[PDB]
Symmetry: D2
Subunit: 129 residues, 4 copies
């Protein structure tokens, strides 16, 4: 639609689940920092931006990436792992997965303390004139 074939996470994105994610600038190493907002929770009492850290590729046309999200209002951590593609028409999307980790009190309960899921993000409304 405007680009021919290029993906960069720097900017902002929004997910079909309602979650939003914002990324400033990725370092030459490939690491990056960000701010992540969730619209759905197991206990939504005080959802805040969860700081994120991780790494992305920028060699391929549509590379893989991944990052941790460290919660603020409840002790937990969630990693995300996926790829950014370009549909037929020159439209950009992120097809990713996630993994949530509960904060148990015994090693005998680690088994239930894990949770996997899926997520799809897209470029937030850039609008036009």
């Amino acid at each position: 639609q405007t680009v021919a074939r290029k993906c960069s996470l720097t900017g902002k994105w929004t997910n079909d689940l309602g979650s939003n994610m914002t990324i400033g600038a990725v370092n030459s190493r490939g690491e990056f920092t960000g701010t992540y907002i969730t619209a759905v929770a197991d206990n939504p009492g005080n959802i805040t931006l969860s700081p994120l850290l991780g790494i992305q590729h920028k060699r391929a046309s549509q590379p893989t990436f991944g990052f941790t999200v460290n919660w603020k209002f409840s002790e937990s951590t969630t990693v995300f792992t996926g790829q950014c593609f370009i549909d037929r028409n020159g439209k950009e999307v992120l097809k990713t997965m996630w993994l949530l980790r509960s904060s148990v009190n015994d090693i005998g309960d680690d088994w239930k303390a894990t949770r996997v899921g899926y997520n799809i993000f897209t470029r937030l409304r850039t609008q036009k004139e």
Copy 2:
């Protein structure tokens, strides 16, 4: 006292699968950087240290953590998510999971491009019992 009710990732660990991980120092934000070595691969032709980045907790006795590992010898990314516990006797272990992301060329193949797994790390050479 040391070794009894306190987990810090700073130092070195070793995994039952053969993989080793080394972490320098975790920042006051809770983020950290590191060097990760794998002993098993889908294509082991030139395994190197894969730079890692992420975040850990240090509030609880046995908190949750998580981090990305960005590959060098093949384009991929793998996140890790788990908790560090203290067994009955006062021994420290890491019970974690992982998630690998393949670098596809079409959005119609993202489905197979994900892979989940499990991993267990321990303190590399402590004392005895």
Copy 3:
């Protein structure tokens, strides 16, 4: 009416990935048998119906289910686990996950031999509502 606050797997479904599934009749125990067709594979040389066996609930309004799919043209097994919901308007969907198991030759490679994913199915041949 047949449609209204009620989901039953017996009949046929189709997935957004292009895969299709057909289920005859579920037993009073809750077990059921079926025929499953995949449109995407790691090696698509001779895709056939993969026999399926498993169990479903029919107590709730939109219950959970799950089943194994035993491959024919390549030795593997894949389980599916999800729930059948009813959107706002009264429409039925299946939001499920899957898990694929490769047929390794050593216990030292079980780690890579697992694969998780997501899938969404709907009623094949729907009307306007």
Copy 4:
């Protein structure tokens, strides 16, 4: 005991988590039925045998398998997917994974309603030659 290159699930097994599983006889199609007992739960108020159903391979030396477990004391379903191996010495083990599915009330909560994990089973107390 008289196996060192042959796996059959028919009999009984025990898991490192404390869960036990029992399987009668696998049908020539490759399907089977069984009784599964859990030692750990998210709400252990009345753990019972959960009926299981699924399919296994018996072509390879150490094949893959998989099956559903339909809960009795709480509405849920859990599939298992793994492989049975033979360690160096001629000892049999099952390295598998699991996936749990919660029984949500809205399609907007399917995201948290999934849970993945790992499990390892071994032959229960075998008799001598």
